[PDB]
Design a protein around this ligand. Structure first.
Ligand SMILES: CCCCCCCCCCCCCCCCCC(=O)OC[C@H](COP(=O)([O-])OCC(O)COP(=O)([O-])OC[C@@H](COC(=O)CCCCCCCCCCCCCCCCC)OC(=O)CCCCCCCCCCCCCCCCC)OC(=O)CCCCCCCCCCCCCCCCC
Ligand code: BCL
Ligand code: BCL
Ligand SMILES: COC(C)(C)C/C=C/C(C)=C/C=C/C(C)=C/C=C/C(C)=C/C=C/C=C(C)/C=C/C=C(\C)CC/C=C(/C)CCC=C(C)C
Ligand SMILES: COC(C)(C)C/C=C/C(C)=C/C=C/C(C)=C/C=C/C(C)=C/C=C/C=C(C)/C=C/C=C(\C)CC/C=C(\C)CCC=C(C)C
Ligand SMILES: COC(C)(C)C/C=C/C(C)=C/C=C/C(C)=C/C=C/C(C)=C/C=C/C=C(C)/C=C/C=C(\C)CC/C=C(\C)CCC=C(C)C
Ligand SMILES: COC(C)(C)C/C=C/C(C)=C/C=C/C(C)=C/C=C/C(C)=C/C=C/C=C(C)/C=C/C=C(\C)CC/C=C(\C)CCC=C(C)C
Ligand SMILES: COC(C)(C)C/C=C/C(C)=C/C=C/C(C)=C/C=C/C(C)=C/C=C/C=C(C)/C=C/C=C(\C)CC/C=C(\C)CCC=C(C)C
Ligand SMILES: COC(C)(C)C/C=C/C(C)=C/C=C/C(C)=C/C=C/C(C)=C\C=C\C=C(C)\C=C\C=C(/C)CC/C=C(\C)CCC=C(C)C
Ligand SMILES: COC(C)(C)C\C=C/C(C)=C/C=C/C(C)=C/C=C/C(C)=C/C=C/C=C(C)/C=C/C=C(\C)CC/C=C(\C)CCC=C(C)C
Ligand SMILES: COC(C)(C)C\C=C/C(C)=C/C=C/C(C)=C/C=C/C(C)=C/C=C\C=C(C)\C=C/C=C(\C)CC/C=C(\C)CCC=C(C)C
Ligand SMILES: COC(C)(C)C\C=C/C(C)=C/C=C\C(C)=C\C=C\C(C)=C\C=C\C=C(C)\C=C\C=C(/C)CC/C=C(\C)CCC=C(C)C
Lengths: 60, 254, 53, 43, 44, 44, 43, 53, 53, 43, 53, 43, 36, 48, 39
């Protein structure tokens, strides 16, 4: 009974928005996981001795 | 032979690397032609023969002389492809264009299409050198005993819908290899049916078959003999079971 | 020129349109990066300097 | 032709709503682009 | 007659007309933007 | 220009809407990260 | 003879159309190489 | 020169079309990049120089 | 010399067409490249030298 | 005889068209070699 | 000497023509390059000098 | 006798056409060699 | 009258877009004369 | 074409027209006020 | 007002015959004053 939208257009509009936002939520999840990955990497690197950030370059 | 250029900068090293490029070209030819013994000539979706038959030509036929007097097999050949050719295919074109799928018209696990497809191997079983059947039930395999692991026999068979369907009865083994290929089920419906060991996960209390649900365990192809199993029946069974990872997924739980 | 429409008697709209989208977006990104590669034609740094920021 | 199962009427409806949302998007985006030209111009 | 796709000359002309509409719109936008970028920063 | 509604006869709209959501969100992060990189255009 | 299933007439029509497209391509290309030779000769 | 259309009694137009499309696009890209690497025809650097930027 | 139309009774037109097309194209490229790699046949360097650019 | 199953007439035809294409190719190549020779000889 | 048409009864003319074609092209390229190496037979350097280009 | 299954009649015609092409090749090659010995001899 | 509304919508948008074409032309013209 | 049902065609056409005219006037005044962009100022000096 | 599709074309054509005259006179004037004083 509740949740009943009489109008055809409003029903279509709330559906399409749901679909679009679902996709954007997937993308955000992916971006966030990548971000956590790289950032945790950097941080764990901060736990390392100072000679890690001193190393000579290979020029390449 | 240092600093000895025959012409220009070309020395033994250059000659060798170039000779290698040439040999390699011939070798890619050789291999991508020997990978043509099965599957060619190229077809359309209509079953016809197409204009693009590849830029590499199909090679000249060779011959496999089989053990146990099973005859001579010639690849590439028309007999080879026509034997393993499926007909009466329950499929419907999705479009007049090519490069689009073909939907299964009916029940696919039965109609033998898609992941559930099978191939008409010959209804003669697989043999060892001595000519005895390769797959025997562990009871005819004289001397065969469980040397380790969980003996599944008598364990219930949980399926993809988490429901139970029967109890394991016997183990079908590769005697020359000494390993378990198929396991048999004493189903609730009073029938015996095989299921590949690679598709069944032995737990401590049970055997789980997440491939297919319960409605399917009954319509599994049977064996005309209870002591042997042919290559054909093996393909039918294995395809049927493996197709459940796609065609019974609406039923799979957990 | 009168009969270019027969292209859709050869190709299917679906695959053609996938191709078109991919190719056009790829090309756009490519050219934008080409420009951003030049210290000139890089609208961002140009505006940064113009307005003394 | 109808490859997806939809008719001209359903497609008209769906396009109407899609372009509604599209013009909303472009409106919001041109607003924000204007405000940014206000903050940090780029031309 | 010949159709590797199923569409007869009729559906083909229809689809083509709409596709070319979209193409000319795309091209109009690009022409406008190119003229602009020329004004702001010529490249010839 | 008026017969563009025929695209929904070509592509399922459910998947197209999900895909647009993805594409637009990713484009947004792309540009924000492009802008964030530049000190003149970074706001943090 | 036809390795693709065409007849001489289907082929002739297809070829008229292919030729139209090719000549249009070549036309634009000629226009452009001309404009170039006027703008920065390479010969 | 009067029976070239017979080529389509040999090759399938789908494949030929896709092939030549790829071919032309890559050819064009390579020629453009070639010029772009020769700084006397790099229209971008030129226009920078001609217009004093 | 008059019977050379039998190379079509021995070979398949499709494979020969594609192969010799590849051959001609790669040959053309190799030759243009050999020129470009020589300053006296690089039409581009020669042009920028001739027009005093 | 045929290793591909063509008849003398289709083959005579194919060869006619192939030779025509080849001679067009050579003609354009000759135009070009001449132009090049006039502009910058090599022999 | 006259019976040399019988080598076509030992060899597939298809194989043989392909192999001859390949051998010939590669030999030719090899030789033309052995020439381009020697400064005296690089007809391009020769032309440059002859024509004062 | 026939490893490749060609009767003498067909083999002979094939060698006819083959030798014709061969001698054409050798002829063009001889002309070029003549020109090149005259332009820069090597012996 | 939905049909009548789209009919005149077309006219409105048609003439308004012609004015927009005129305005863009005018902007190109000013930019040529004086930049901003 | 929903707007036409919502308001007398006259109501949105008259409002939009007046708004646009006012905007044009304001832009022009802003350009004339500035010595640069004063169309009258640049021309007299150039001819003189 | 409704009027007629014909009547609307009728007076709209007469309205144009006046608008054009107005524009012509105006442009002649603009040219003449461009001659006398350019801007
Ligand atoms: C089915 C296919 C199977 C393939 C494998 C088959 C293998 C079997 C054998 C086949 C036969 C292969 C040939 C073998 C013999 C020759 C090999 C060789 O290269 O000898 C050195 C010999 C040169 O000796 P050198 O002393 O270094 O040169 C003296 C010259 O007088 C002048 O040289 P330089 O001293 O001036 O220095 C070099 C110079 C000039 O260099 C050159 O002369 C040519 C450089 C450009 C060559 C471009 C080659 C492009 C070929 C590929 C493109 C098409 C794709 C095809 C392949 C597709 C698959 C990937 O370099 C520059 O770039 C100068 C730039 C301008 C500066 C200002 O070869 C050459 O003449 C140059 C390269 C020739 C092209 C190679 C094509 C491959
Ligand atoms: C000097 C450099 C100038 C500049 C020079 C130009 C010029 C010149 C041009 C561009 C063009 C573009 N510029 Mg710009 N541009 C600049 C700065 C930017 C920046 C930036 C952040 O710096 C951005 C993001 C953009 C953005 C853009 C794109 C919006 C646009 C190219 C569209 C495209 O790729 O179509 C290709 C994309 C596709 C085909 C696929 C799109 C995917 C969609 C979303 C999915 C399909 C939906 C579905 C089918 C729905 C169906 C309904 C339909 C609506 C009918 N520009 C700078 C300031 N720009 C070009 C343009 O707009 O061309 C028209 C153009 O001509
Ligand atoms: C310095 C600039 C030039 C000049 C430049 C122009 C230019 C350029 C134009 C005008 C135009 C007009 N000029 Mg003049 N004109 C000048 C000098 C004058 C003097 C004067 C006192 O010296 C007068 C009386 C006028 C007046 C006029 C009108 C006759 C006309 C505008 C009427 C209009 O908009 O319709 C008003 C609307 C109605 C008809 C309402 C009627 C309602 C009824 C009565 C109810 N000019 C000076 C000398 N003039 C325009 C023209 O020709 O008219 C289109 C035109 O293009
Ligand atoms: C380090 O040492 C260096 C490298 C310096 C020097 C080394 C030198 C050495 C190792 C030299 C070795 C030389 C040798 C072993 C030479 C051998 C040469 C031979 C065996 C040559 C034979 C040639 C034969 C030919 C070309 C025959 C051609 C025949 C035909 C064209 C006809 C085709 C034949 C047949 C039967 C067709 C008829 C078929 C039917 C069915 C009737
Ligand atoms: C080192 O190398 C460099 C690059 C420096 C120098 C060398 C460069 C080289 C080697 C360049 C080579 C270039 C070549 C070979 C270019 C060739 C270009 C060609 C052949 C272009 C052809 C274009 C044709 C077009 C665009 C045709 C379009 C046709 C259509 C749009 C219509 C399609 C057909 C239809 C609709 C008919 C369908 C009908 C029915 C009944 C189904
Ligand atoms: C590296 O070198 C650089 C990049 C520097 C230089 C070189 C650049 C190059 C080579 C660039 C090349 C660019 C090219 C080739 C661009 C071509 C662009 C084209 C052909 C664009 C076409 C666009 C068409 C569009 C956007 C069409 C859109 C159509 C619609 C949205 C509506 C269509 C509706 C339909 C089909 C509904 C009817 C369907 C049914 C089933 C009834
Ligand atoms: C280091 O090496 C360098 C490069 C410096 C020096 C050496 C260079 C070398 C080794 C160069 C070698 C060049 C060669 C061997 C070139 C050979 C070229 C040939 C054979 C070219 C042939 C071209 C043929 C063409 C373009 C044919 C075109 C045909 C058509 C368009 C007709 C279409 C045919 C149809 C429709 C068939 C009819 C079908 C039916 C069913 C009736
Ligand atoms: C250090 O290395 C260098 C390169 C410096 C020194 C060189 C060393 C060596 C070892 C060089 C070797 C050279 C050789 C062995 C050259 C050989 C050349 C030959 C054998 C050339 C043959 C050419 C033959 C041709 C072009 C034949 C063409 C034939 C046809 C076009 C027709 C064939 C038949 C057909 C199409 C019809 C078939 C008939 C029916 C009835 C179906
Ligand atoms: C190197 O390249 C860089 C990145 C630097 C620069 C280049 C960037 C490029 C090439 C960007 C390209 C961007 C493009 C092509 C963007 C296109 C975007 C489009 C076509 C967006 C369409 C959006 C449509 C939407 C959001 C419609 C939604 C509709 C609904 C959700 C229905 C519900 C309706 C509502 C809520 C309205 C009620 C009022
Ligand atoms: C304005 O006048 C002047 C030039 C005098 C001003 C003076 C200086 C200035 C400010 C110059 C301007 C520089 C600027 C801002 C240049 C760039 C302007 C641009 C890029 C305008 C372009 C806007 C383009 C947009 C928003 C792109 C629209 C295109 C799409 C959204 C493509 C989407 C395509 C689809 C959905 C078709 C897909 C079809 C299939 C079959 C998949
Ligand atoms: C500084 O500049 C700023 C920025 C402030 C503004 C710049 C420029 C502007 C604002 C430009 C404006 C341009 C406009 C408004 C152009 C058009 C003007 C018009 C239409 C003016 C007004 C009236 C024109 C009329 C009435 C012309 C001719 C009409 C007739 C002859 C129709 C008479 C009808 C009859 C006799 C109908 C009898 C018959 C029947 C069947 C009813
Ligand atoms: C330096 O050069 C020298 C001086 C030596 C050379 C000689 C001459 C030069 C350079 C002259 C330069 C400029 C001149 C002479 C400019 C003159 C401008 C004029 C006369 C402009 C405008 C005249 C406008 C008129 C007469 C407008 C009349 C408008 C009406 C009668 C209204 C018509 C419309 C009506 C009644 C309908 C209204 C309807 C409704 C519904 C409102």
């Amino acid at each position: 009974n509740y949740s009943h939208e009489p109008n055809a257009v409003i029903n279509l509009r709330v559906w399409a928005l749901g679909q679009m936002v679902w996709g954007a939520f997937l993308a955000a999840v992916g971006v966030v996981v990548v971000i956590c990955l790289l950032v945790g990497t950097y941080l764990a690197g901060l736990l390392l001795p100072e000679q890690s950030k001193q190393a000579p370059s290979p020029y390449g | 032979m240092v600093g000895v250029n025959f012409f220009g900068d070309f020395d033994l090293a250059s000659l060798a690397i170039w000779s290698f490029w040439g040999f390699l070209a011939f070798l890619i030819y050789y291999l991508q032609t020997e990978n043509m013994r099965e599957g060619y000539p190229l077809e359309m979706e209509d079953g016809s023969v197409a204009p693009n038959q590849g830029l590499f030509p199909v090679p000249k036929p060779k011959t496999f002389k089989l053990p146990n007097g099973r005859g001579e097999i010639v690849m590439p050949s028309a007999e080879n492809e026509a034997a393993h050719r499926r007909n009466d295919l329950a499929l419907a074109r999705t479009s007049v264009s090519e490069g689009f799928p073909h939907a299964p018209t009916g029940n696919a696990l039965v109609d033998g299409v898609g992941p559930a497809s099978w191939v008409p191997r010959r209804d003669e079983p697989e043999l060892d050198a001595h000519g005895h059947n390769k797959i025997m039930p562990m009871a005819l395999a004289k001397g065969f005993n469980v040397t380790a692991g969980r003996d599944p026999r008598g364990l219930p068979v949980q399926a993809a819908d988490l429901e139970v369907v029967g109890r394991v009865s016997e183990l079908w083994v590769d005697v020359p290899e000494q390993m378990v290929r198929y396991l048999e089920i004493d189903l609730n419906s009073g029938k015996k049916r095989l299921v590949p060991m690679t598709l069944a996960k032995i737990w401590a209390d049970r055997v789980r078959v997440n491939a297919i649900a319960s409605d399917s365990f009954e319509n599994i192809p049977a064996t005309r003999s209870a002591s042997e199993v042919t290559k054909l029946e093996e393909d039918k069974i294995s395809g049927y079971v493996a197709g459940g990872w796609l065609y019974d997924a609406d039923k799979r739980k957990r | 020129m009168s009969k270019f429409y027969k292209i859709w008697q050869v190709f299917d709209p679906r695959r053609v349109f996938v191709a078109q989208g991919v190719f056009l977006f790829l090309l756009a990104v490519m050219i934008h990066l080409i420009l951003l590669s030049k210290p000139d034609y890089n609208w961002l740094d140009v505006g940064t300097a113009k307005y003394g920021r | 032709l109808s490859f997806t199962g939809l008719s001209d009427e359903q497609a008209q409806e769906l396009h109407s709503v899609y372009m509604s949302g599209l013009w909303l998007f472009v409106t919001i985006a041109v607003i924000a682009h204007i405000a940014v030209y206000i903050w940090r111009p780029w031309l």
